[PDB]
């Protein structure tokens, strides 16, 4: 069965839109699940003794919009109070209520498809024995898939994927590669090199395909406790070419950080 | 002419809201075009032989909200079935239908401003000769302009702009610069240096303005097949200063990767 909503009703009766249908629609438009909120303090909440007064705050919980207009929540002293918006559709006259709780008791209850009380924490209010010491809002999560953007400003941080690889390059050289965003690689040199000539391919493992650059990358390294240096080339095929001086039978400790981009312009 | 919707209609005749007007509003709020969807399986679809039963799935296509409640789609065996939502506004009683097709036949038809049937693929269901082997959803695209965000988590990748520049710095030295996000630069050294003294400005081309740093950047390089190194300074004014030892008539191959930031804290 297909149940249609955003469609015209020729005889004004065909497609009635329920509050739960709009709830689900709104959740989908904003990219919210039942474990987050949309919240806006149009005016600042006021703290008086062990109470928080929401003067003019709008909340969207489970795609349901409501307003807190001079709504006071009594708080527990010397405690971290978790402020919840609770939606119980069976309480027909007053389906929404606020509570101050000892823990984040957000339950992710699907109120738009089934029965149950939705509880969702939106504020954290810390108290002393006399009043509010600090308030921290709960994060409003936007769950999106693929984004096309022109400009972005981040005040906190962006967490991107990280992949790691250890390569036993041969001749005693060990590379520890860390790739972030599938593009930026930082190579950390370890081990001790011996029995190699300039221009020669190293005798060990080639770099795994996911860490191979599109163009040859020359990475400078240093010999620990010496004034001497070397460089290696990570070739697009994964091979590593030695470009330091010829090294004899005696191993020399190799260290240093070198960076490269995997991707070119496109 | 101006057509108003989210406004008071004193006589309940002025600003009635059409389904296409809400469709466009919803598309604008979520940042969707006609080539994507908003989709949520509130309960898991069920696979039975060559059929997919959508138990409780909500879809937004062209800003139009509808629900699939125990709606079964018959599948082609030993095939990759592309599941489509098809919207035909002329079919007033049943404007939405589902189809299983041999290709992604999404047509991007503007149903809110023009005529036509909107076809949009939302699921990919692969079958054997007897039933479903795998299911993959179609990506939900968010087309945005300028974003202000506190924190972000990326599970895939961020694609940022890339600019490249080759500089014939003089004395046989060649720099290949790759700039990403208009900030991070990785310099790759090439060529072979000769006839230069420490502290001397190199005899060739200065770095183009878009690659110039705010502060002097010292980039370490290596001499191929040797245990010797050098460094160059990329000055904010665009000039390059040699800071290796004095080089005679015989050129020595220069290689290595060095990174710098164009922008400081601002």
């Amino acid at each position: 069965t297909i149940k249609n909503f955003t469609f015209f009703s020729p005889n004004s009766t065909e497609f009635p839109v329920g509050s739960n249908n709009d709830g689900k629609l709104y959740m989908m438009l904003t990219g919210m699940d039942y474990r987050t909120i949309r919240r806006k303090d149009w005016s600042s909440p006021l703290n008086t003794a062990l109470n928080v007064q929401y003067t003019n705050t709008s909340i969207i919980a489970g795609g349901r919009y409501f307003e807190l207009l001079n709504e006071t929540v009594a708080l527990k002293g010397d405690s971290v109070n978790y402020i919840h918006a609770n939606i119980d559709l069976t309480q027909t006259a007053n389906p929404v209520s606020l509570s101050a709780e000892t823990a984040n008791n957000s339950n992710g209850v699907d109120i738009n498809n089934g029965s149950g009380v939705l509880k969702v924490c939106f504020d954290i209010v810390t108290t002393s024995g006399t009043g509010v010491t600090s308030t921290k809002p709960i994060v409003q999560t936007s769950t999106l898939d693929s984004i096309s953007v022109n400009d972005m400003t981040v005040s906190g941080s962006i967490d991107v994927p990280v992949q790691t690889l250890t390569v036993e390059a041969g001749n005693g050289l060990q590379l520890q590669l860390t790739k972030k965003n599938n593009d930026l690689v930082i190579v950390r040199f370890f081990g001790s090199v011996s029995n190699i000539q300039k221009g020669w391919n190293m005798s060990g493992t080639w770099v795994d395909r996911p860490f191979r650059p599109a163009a040859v990358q020359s990475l400078v390294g240093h010999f620990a406790g010496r004034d001497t240096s070397f460089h290696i080339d990570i070739n697009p095929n994964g091979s590593i070419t030695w470009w330091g001086a010829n090294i004899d039978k005696t191993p020399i400790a190799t260290r240093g950080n070198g960076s490269y981009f995997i991707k070119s312009a496109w | 002419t101006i057509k108003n919707f989210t406004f008071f209609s004193p006589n309940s005749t002025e600003f009635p809201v059409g389904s296409n007007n809400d469709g466009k509003l919803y598309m604008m709020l979520t940042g969707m075009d006609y080539r994507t969807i908003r989709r949520k399986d509130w309960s898991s679809p069920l696979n039975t032989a060559l059929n997919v039963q959508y138990t409780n799935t909500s879809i937004i296509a062209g800003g139009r909200y509808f629900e699939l409640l125990n709606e079964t789609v018959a599948l082609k065996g030993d095939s990759v079935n592309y599941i489509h939502a098809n919207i035909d506004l002329t079919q007033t009683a049943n404007p939405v239908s589902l189809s299983a097709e041999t290709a992604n036949n999404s047509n991007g038809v503007d149903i809110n401003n023009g005529s036509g049937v909107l076809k949009v693929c939302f699921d990919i269901v692969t079958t054997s000769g007897t039933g479903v082997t795998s299911t993959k959803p179609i990506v939900q695209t968010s087309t945005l302009d300028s974003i202000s965000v506190n924190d972000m988590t990326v599970s895939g990748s961020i694609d940022v702009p890339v600019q490249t520049l080759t500089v014939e710095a003089g004395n046989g030295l060649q720099l290949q610069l790759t700039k990403k996000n208009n900030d991070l630069v990785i310099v790759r050294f090439f060529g072979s240096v000769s006839n230069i003294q420490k502290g001397w400005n190199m005899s060739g081309t200065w770095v183009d303005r878009p690659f110039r740093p705010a502060a002097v950047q010292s980039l370490v390089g290596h001499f191929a097949g040797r245990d010797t190194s050098f460094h160059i300074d990329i000055n904010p004014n665009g000039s390059i200063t040699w800071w290796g030892a004095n080089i005679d008539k015989t050129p020595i191959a220069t290689r290595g990767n060095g990174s710098y930031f164009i922008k400081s804290a601002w």
Epitope: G199, W200, A215, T241 | -
Partner: nanobody, 122 residues
Framework: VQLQESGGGLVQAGGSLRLSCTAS????????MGWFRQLAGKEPELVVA????????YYADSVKGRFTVSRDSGKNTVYLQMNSLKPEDTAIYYC????????????????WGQGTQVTVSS
């Protein structure tokens, strides 16, 4: 990939011979073109090679100061001009090409030649 050899033939001890080799394309960075040789029914050895990207040559101790590797400029062509040719150097010279620098391992070479025979009398 594909290689096109030239030169070879006979010459007396203390004489001179020239080898030519052209590669159809380059497989990548650290592009090396050289020759391998199998002397008196023994394992092959990388006699000579040239790193195009670095303009660095490699010569095995046995051929040092006699054999000279040159490149034909812009084209992917390598020449081997050998002087003071001795009867121990009587072997079949196989042209080799690869991306990733010099290597003793035959497998690691992307391009392998048919082989050009060099014969020198006592």
């Amino acid at each position: 990939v594909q290689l096109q050899e030239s030169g070879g033939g006979l010459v007396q001890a203390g004489g001179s011979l020239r080898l030519s080799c052209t590669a159809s394309r380059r497989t990548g960075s650290n592009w090396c073109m050289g020759w391998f040789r199998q002397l008196a029914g023994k394992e092959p050895e990388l006699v000579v090679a040239l790193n195009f990207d670095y303009d660095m040559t490699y010569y095995a101790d046995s051929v040092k100061g006699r054999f000279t590797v040159s490149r034909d400029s812009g084209k992917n062509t390598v020449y081997l001009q050998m002087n003071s040719l001795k009867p121990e150097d009587t072997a079949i010279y196989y042209c080799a090409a690869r991306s990733g620098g010099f290597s003793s391992n035959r497998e690691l070479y992307d391009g392998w030649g048919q082989g050009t025979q060099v014969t020198v009398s006592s």
